[PDB]
């Protein structure tokens, strides 16, 4: 995080003070794929 | 006009004061279609 202050301020010397560099965010791990159920079917057995 | 103040303020309760709602303008009714006159004609009767 000392080098993160140099990466944002574009300087190789950091003075005494409070500096904001970036933001933390939790990355998504899984992916929920949903669909409706097996109700409301079609009578395909009448021709097949 | 009391309900006109509710739509521009996004609130169902209007307090005491002077408020501007919209703008008034007289709408047009007719349309004047103009063309130049029938002078400077060309001799079409010389072949017709």
């Amino acid at each position: 995080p000392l080098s993160e202050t140099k990466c944002t301020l574009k300087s190789f010397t950091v003075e005494k003070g409070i500096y904001q560099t970036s933001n933390f965010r939790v990355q998504p791990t899984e992916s929920i794929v949903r669909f409706p159920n097996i109700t409301n079917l079609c009578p395909f057995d009448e021709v097949f | 006009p009391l309900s006109e103040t509710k739509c521009t303020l996004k609130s169902f309760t209007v307090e005491k004061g002077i408020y501007q709602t919209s703008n008034f303008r007289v709408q047009p009714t007719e349309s004047i279609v103009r063309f130049p006159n029938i002078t400077n004609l060309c001799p079409f009767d010389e072949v017709f």
Binding site: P1, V14, K16, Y19, Q20, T21, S22, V26 | -
Partner: protein, 163 residues
């Protein structure tokens, strides 16, 4: 199902100068440190990398909501509440008085800025990098930069007026 976005917030770095030391203190602002993955929880956010103490001294680097920080002593970054000064009350009665018997004459400096650097930006060279095809469509935008030339002259006529 209740849709809530997952935990996010700003990251700030509390550090002294590079000529003094190199230790940092990561502040997850708005983020509790039970949801992040030698630690202290504040109102602005849980602080990672600072030793919290009970005494309060004169600090230099503020954090937020009363919590402040400084670099003290085998040295690390500590964090404490902001001290409001030394408590020294004055007694009171109905028949006593306190008269000064001596004084001191001090000189206290006060610095107030008056003027600044007068600049002037032209429309032909800043927008067009010595380009001739750029200037023909510069006339199609009307009079944007003519008003910016009047504003920059109106600033620069106030700077010698302020002197």
């Amino acid at each position: 199902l209740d849709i809530t976005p997952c935990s996010f917030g700003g990251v700030s770095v509390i550090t002294p100068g590079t000529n003094t030391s190199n230790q940092v203190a990561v502040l997850y602002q708005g983020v509790n440190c039970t949801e992040v993955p030698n630690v202290f929880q504040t109102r602005a956010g849980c602080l990672i990398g600072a030793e919290y103490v009970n005494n309060s001294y004169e600090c230099d680097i503020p954090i937020g909501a009363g919590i402040c920080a400084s670099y003290q002593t085998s040295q690390s970054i500590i964090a404490y509440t902001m001290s409001l000064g030394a408590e020294n009350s004055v007694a009171y009665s109905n028949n006593s008085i306190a008269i000064p018997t001596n004084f001191t004459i001090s000189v206290t400096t006060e610095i107030l800025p008056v003027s600044m650097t007068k600049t002037s930006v032209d429309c032909t060279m800043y927008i067009c990098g010595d380009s001739t095809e750029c200037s023909n469509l510069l006339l199609q935008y009307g009079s944007f930069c003519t008003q910016l030339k009047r504003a920059l002259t109106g600033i620069a006529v106030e700077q010698d007026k302020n002197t």
